[PDB]
A = this chain, B = another copy of it.
Amino acid sequence: TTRDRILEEAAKLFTEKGYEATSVQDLAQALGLSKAALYHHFGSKEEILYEISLLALKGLVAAGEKALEVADPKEALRRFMEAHARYFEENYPFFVTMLQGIKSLSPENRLKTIALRDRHEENLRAILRRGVEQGVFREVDVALAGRAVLSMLNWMIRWFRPDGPMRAEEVARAYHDLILRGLERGS
């Protein structure tokens, strides 16, 4: 019914069948729509791919921006990482799809996708920079620190198992402990 549910179903199908191997015909059948209705309401597989990517990235950006406010930089960083991982898990299929079709978006939509990813990274940098300035974090290359944190969260799409024992959030909480305190002992 709602465009949102359709996008969700499409994302699951793309995740199971693969975006390239999924035909418009497949999408219509799985969604309970005639091909005609799908073309009229969505135009193409690319438009469906774009809206899925948009929901995922906008939801992620919002999930992280909600931690940018936390007073304690250490706590802000932890909430950012945990929110990111939780959102990733709850919307797993949207993230997998988005990875199987970036090169298939129109030019302007690819720019929009990059802008959103840049925004999420900027919010993380703001948290780190604030922590540095108010002496909560050691002076480090913020740009690299953020890339490091994002690498840990984003690379999860390559190994995390949705029906596994651990919740992405718990994984993220351990990554936070690791990145905050480091590996050395003593101090």
Contact = CB atoms under 8 A, between A and B. Distances in A.
A175 B148 CA distance: 7
Copies in the complex: 2
A187 interface: yes
Contact of A138 (B140, B147, B182): B182
Interface stretch (A25-33, A55-63, A88-96, A128-136): A128-136
Q: How large is the interface on A (under 10, 10 to 19, 20 to 34, 35 or more residues)?
A: 35 or more
Interface stretch (A2-10, A41-49, A105-113, A152-160): A152-160
Contacts of A141: 174
Contact of A147 (B18, B136, B147, B159): B159
A-B pairs, 3 with minimum CB distance: A182-B182, A151-B155, A138-B185
